[PDB]
Amino acid sequence: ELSEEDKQLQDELEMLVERLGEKDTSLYRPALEELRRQIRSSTTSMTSVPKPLKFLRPHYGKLKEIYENMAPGENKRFAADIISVLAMTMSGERECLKYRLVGSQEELASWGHEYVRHLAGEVAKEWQELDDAEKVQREPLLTLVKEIVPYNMAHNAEHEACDLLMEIEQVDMLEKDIDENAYAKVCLYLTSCVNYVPEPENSALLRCALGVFRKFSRFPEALRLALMLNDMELVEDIFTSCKDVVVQKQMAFMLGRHGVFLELSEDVEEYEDLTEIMSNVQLNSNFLALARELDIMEPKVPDDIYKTHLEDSARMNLASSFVNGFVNAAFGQDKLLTDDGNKWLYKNKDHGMLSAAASLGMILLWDVDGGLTQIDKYLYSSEDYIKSGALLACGIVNSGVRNECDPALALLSDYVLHNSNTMRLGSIFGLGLAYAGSNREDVLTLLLPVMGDSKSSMEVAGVTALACGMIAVGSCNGDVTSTILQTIMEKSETELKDTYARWLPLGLGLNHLGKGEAIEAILAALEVVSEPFRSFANTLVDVCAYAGSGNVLKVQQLLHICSEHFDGAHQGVAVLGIALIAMGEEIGAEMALRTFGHLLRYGEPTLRRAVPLALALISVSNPRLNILDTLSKFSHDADPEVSYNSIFAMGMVGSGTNNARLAAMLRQLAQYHAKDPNNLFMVRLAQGLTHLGKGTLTLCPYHSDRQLMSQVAVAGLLTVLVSFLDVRNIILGKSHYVLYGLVAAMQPRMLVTFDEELRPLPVSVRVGQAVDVVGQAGKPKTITGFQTHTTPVLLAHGERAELATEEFLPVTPILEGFVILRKNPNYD
Amino acid sequence: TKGPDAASKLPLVTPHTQCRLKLLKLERIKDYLLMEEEFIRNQEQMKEERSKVDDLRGTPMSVGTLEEIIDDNHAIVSTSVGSEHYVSILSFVDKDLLEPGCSVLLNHKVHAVIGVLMDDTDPLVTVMKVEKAPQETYADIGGLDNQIQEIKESVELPLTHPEYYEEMGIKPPKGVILYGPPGTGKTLLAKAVANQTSATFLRVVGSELIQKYLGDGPKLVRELFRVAEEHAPSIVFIDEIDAIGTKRYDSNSGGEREIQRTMLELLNQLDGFDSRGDVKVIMATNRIETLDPALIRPGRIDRKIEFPLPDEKTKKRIFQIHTSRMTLADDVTLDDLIMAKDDLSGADIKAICTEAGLMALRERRMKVTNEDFKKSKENVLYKTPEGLYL
Amino acid sequence: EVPKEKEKEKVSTAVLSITAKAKKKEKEKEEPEPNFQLLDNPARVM
Ligand SMILES: Nc1ncnc2c1ncn2[C@@H]1O[C@H](COP(=O)(O)OP(=O)(O)OP(=O)(O)O)[C@@H](O)[C@H]1O
Ligand SMILES: [Mg+2]
């Protein structure tokens, strides 16, 4: 059914192969020459059906026999190459390189690029099926890899080279073949792959991309990747291995937004400017400038939020204090407490007072001196709760700002180990949330000693655990781990059943956040606790270790824990853990949402209460109808705890968003639960969260490109959610102050620009959804749905900003937060 | 207020190219699905009064239309064969929930009210719901930026940011009509809305609300809008509405009068005496001029969106979108096809791409080329005298 | 004897993409038959 020329070519190939069969052993070389010439002429062409390949299909086995039966020599390999190029089409025992190795070893491009792709995939496959032995068999494969990576580099197939190298498990050779015209499309691909691979490959890819960035002096990207790796030596190297001062200023902004702070010696060009940027001493001023530039500095009382005019005994007033704090957060000004004063910090009926005073701290957030003034007015009270709340307020005020002096340290240390578990219980938490990312030894040396003493309840011990964990998040600080373990090992089955003991394992996990595998020791030194408080501690520390790791095996273990029928709290922790391991990669989050829905339906109450907290954690300050509808249809549940958690999760998912179709849900839910104070309080708290900072702060523990997980934000979120794991006792009662742990998370949601002098540069930007058109395995993402504003500007979730005009070049290729813009020399 | 029905859809793997990153993303989706499957299996593997109550309940329970509930324990029901009985109500029934016309449940033999079955949605209108979600995101719509903006302002912004409108006392448009030549994105822009919406989407075709019997078309329209209003927010997409809605002339036949009656029922649902919930309507039309003014009225159809044949930049966008997944050769410059000022719909451009691929495959080549594209353009397009002007 | 109590079993823990790699990582990290019969005087002999 062929053509005349096609049949003639078939006949020629048949004659050549038959001559190879004949035992002349004299004219083999011409025949092999001719076969090779035809095969490479066909393969190098654009034909996708190489005719010599097609017509030698029947003779594959005959060629095998001829290769085996011909005497060793040049013709042997000269025909093995033909057999390999033929095997490119028919396989199953994976011969192509098996006969390429015994070959002529010519340039691995004469046989087209399809041969190269086949041989690259086969090199990978051979690599996996080789044991740690047979090393001598492994060098010749790395020669093929050194021939393949450059070839893929030259032919736009950078993703092919990256796949080959990450599948050979040696992402080290890219540095030799990368060019200034490739680093972007290789680093982006590696970073995209990072989220989805496990360890130790995760770190291998991250370090490979970091090396690529450092090669071409792309310091800010290198620092982002060095922060992904919770490794302070690398970030110190990057921040000090730079000679341009402006880029160091920008990297200091990045370090400040993240929880880190580098102790720099007296050597850098501008040590004091850099430490000021990295200490966030200019966060309050910039925030107030943004507020002025939007006409929002007009404090709004809780009634403006409740909006009960259109469409007061003891607890709704605590709700009023909490919502007032949430709404007027970091603005300094207020109308209830600030101004009249002494009125919503009194009539709050004893214990709630302790949080009402703390509200002041959240209004004077990042404002150390104004904090000092207003708080000190209230820091001297006849009743203990006011002083405890004022100390907590000082802690909140100093949260996120690294003042060279230590006001929090002094004031709150005077009152740690005080002869009352209420000044202790505010000072310890204030120090915990004031020096969270600090990792200072001088504050832990004061906190750790207070978990053990006759004069400390489970409340004080648990809050000390929380504080120490927040101070030393993700640092494996030996003192913290040792003290927490001692406190867990020194208490009986009773006295370990308080639900204030959740916070000792929580301190452990916070101290080991993101460390991952290295946690075996602490889950091996913890297999001596009672049964009911060992599944909880084990599961909590495990989930904290893999925070944002996206380890499907660990999620599988958590789901196994959930499946078990225990007529049990570790199941509730496991649901939150499934949320916690999957707040990173986006693909994991939606699938976790499906899983959480199944848990709500096929689930006992214990994990039914925990699913709402998981929904809140997976989507924080990211109101999406998928989660809000889920929580709303569960906001009316018969079980009080599932309700409470659903309402608070609606608050969290919409935190700092001012969402109107969440405010409507919360008002209608306020009328529906008017006669139930325990739901009214929670709906009020959700309203306060929804209007947090009057639409200027986000609680999301993910900032740079949604890719850097702030350790401190996760610490605060975990404290609050684990406390919710027993709402009815921890928070709907005594320890409602734990809500202020959210301070660790709230962090502006703004884009603010500067010149190279720390002075504002209002410039025009386009703000729009993080969409792309074609990934093409390396192509960047370009904004779709433009909307042009002039900086300063607020960026909502999923919004990126791109300079609308070429006049300025950003130092970092991420326009979120504070960005220094060099004035472009080219033009514009 | 049952709540949105939505449409479950898996994540989307950003890299359309065949590379390891796509494999990792797909493997993550698969491993999450496997964990979900095993979790369900383990739930059912680790797992009285109501049973006896159901035993007392009739075994082959019948469905009958309650009518004129009486007393607190006796009501008149219908057997769905015209007969009606003065039946009793057991304590199992909810009470304070039965309403006349509600399709209650009756014991087969003794004929006692034992259930209410408040889900008597007709199959004809249950089929026309959207449970899947077509994978046509807004990134598959080259150009049509203004049209996309209009429809987003009509059916997306009122759900995603319902503060802008309340902040100035404005009711967002409840009705959009997408009109244009045969193939310009009219149905893509409903597919994309369905894909990206959290609201209950309801596909319909104007030629489907017409029914054989008398008074059934209007009844179907009333039922459709009743379900669309129970589920809220909801979008009702009536494709090719000129099937019903054409000019209302003075009929002489009976079928035509019934069709116009169906149209008037639709008009009353769109903007009638009583009210309309959060149901938003999107009609599609090739020839809008033939539609009745009462239907195109700017109280039932607040926005009218023309989908004209694309201009040059839009055509370039269409070629880019539809050749993205194609192994385009470096010999192809997709500008010669753009420049030719001939009527090219997006459908025509996609057909051109498909025919170019087929020409390449015919030539035994898996990579398309410029001659292939030229041949495809010539052979796909099927369809003023010279010198009369100029 | 009693047939003993059978507990609830999880069904074949699902294998994911990287489960085999994790297992490999763990692997790396780690009669007389007597011919005689004696019967007392009351002998139940079949
Ligand atoms: N703007 C566009 N962008 C991308 N594809 C388009 C566009 N316009 C049309 N198409 C293509 O047209 C085909 C379907 O068009 P569509 O269903 O939107 O047409 P229509 O206006 O509903 O037509 P009709 O009046 O015949 O029902 C698909 O291939 C779609 O890709
Ligand atoms: Mg159509």
UniProtKB/Swiss-Prot annotation, chain A:
The modification N6-acetyllysine is found at residue 497. Residues 629-824 are annotated as: Required for interaction with UBLCP1. The keyword ATP-binding does not apply. One of its GO terms (cellular component) is proteasome regulatory particle. The keyword Phosphoprotein applies. PC repeats lie at residues 355-388, 389-425, 426-460, 463-497, 506-535, 613-644, 663-678. SUPFAM superfamilies: ARM repeat. Found in skeletal muscle, liver, heart, brain, kidney, pancreas, lung and placenta. GO terms for biological process: proteasome-mediated ubiquitin-dependent protein catabolic process; regulation of protein catabolic process. Belongs to the proteasome subunit S2 family. Component of the 19S proteasome regulatory particle complex. The 26S proteasome consists of a 20S core particle (CP) and two 19S regulatory subunits (RP). The regulatory particle is made of a lid composed of 9 subunits, a base containing 6 ATPases and few additional components including PSMD2. Interacts with RPGRIP1L. Interacts with CRY1 in a KDM8-dependent manner. Component of the 26S proteasome, a multiprotein complex involved in the ATP-dependent degradation of ubiquitinated proteins. This complex plays a key role in the maintenance of protein homeostasis by removing misfolded or damaged proteins, which could impair cellular functions, and by removing proteins whose functions are no longer required. Therefore, the proteasome participates in numerous cellular processes, including cell cycle progression, apoptosis, or DNA damage repair. Binds to the intracellular domain of tumor necrosis factor type 1 receptor. The binding domain of TRAP1 and TRAP2 resides outside the death domain of TNFR1. This is 26S proteasome non-ATPase regulatory subunit 2.
From Swiss-Prot, chain B:
It is found in: Cytoplasm; Nucleus; Membrane. It is a lipid-anchor. The modification Phosphothreonine is found at residues 14, 384. Keywords: Acetylation, ATP-binding, Cytoplasm, Deafness, Intellectual disability, Isopeptide bond, Lipoprotein, Membrane, Myristate, Nucleotide-binding, Nucleus, Phosphoprotein, Proteasome, Ubl conjugation. GO terms for molecular function: ATP binding; ATP hydrolysis activity; proteasome-activating activity; RNA binding. Residues 47-57 have a biased composition (Basic and acidic residues). It holds the Pfam family AAA. GO terms for biological process: proteasome-mediated ubiquitin-dependent protein catabolic process. Residues 45-58 are annotated as: Disordered. The keyword ATP-binding applies. The keyword Ubl conjugation applies. The modification Phosphotyrosine is found at residue 389. It comes from the Eukaryota. SMART domains: AAA. Belongs to the AAA ATPase family. Component of the 26S proteasome, a multiprotein complex involved in the ATP-dependent degradation of ubiquitinated proteins. This complex plays a key role in the maintenance of protein homeostasis by removing misfolded or damaged proteins, which could impair cellular functions, and by removing proteins whose functions are no longer required. Therefore, the proteasome participates in numerous cellular processes, including cell cycle progression, apoptosis, or DNA damage repair. Component of the 19S proteasome regulatory particle complex. The 26S proteasome consists of a 20S core particle (CP) and two 19S regulatory subunits (RP). The regulatory particle is made of a lid composed of 9 subunits, a base containing 6 ATPases including PSMC1 and few additional components. Interacts with SCA7. Interacts with NGLY1. Interacts with PAAF1. This is 26S proteasome regulatory subunit 4.
From Swiss-Prot, chain C:
It comes from the Eukaryota. The modification Phosphoserine is found at residue 17. The modification Phosphothreonine is found at residue 13. Belongs to the proteasome subunit S1 family. Component of the 19S proteasome regulatory particle complex. The 26S proteasome consists of a 20S core particle (CP) and two 19S regulatory subunits (RP). The regulatory particle is made of a lid composed of 9 subunits, a base containing 6 ATPases and few additional components including PSMD1. Interacts with ADRM1. Interacts with ZFAND1. Component of the 26S proteasome, a multiprotein complex involved in the ATP-dependent degradation of ubiquitinated proteins. This complex plays a key role in the maintenance of protein homeostasis by removing misfolded or damaged proteins, which could impair cellular functions, and by removing proteins whose functions are no longer required. Therefore, the proteasome participates in numerous cellular processes, including cell cycle progression, apoptosis, or DNA damage repair. This is 26S proteasome non-ATPase regulatory subunit 1. The chain holds residues 818 to 885 of 953 of the full protein.
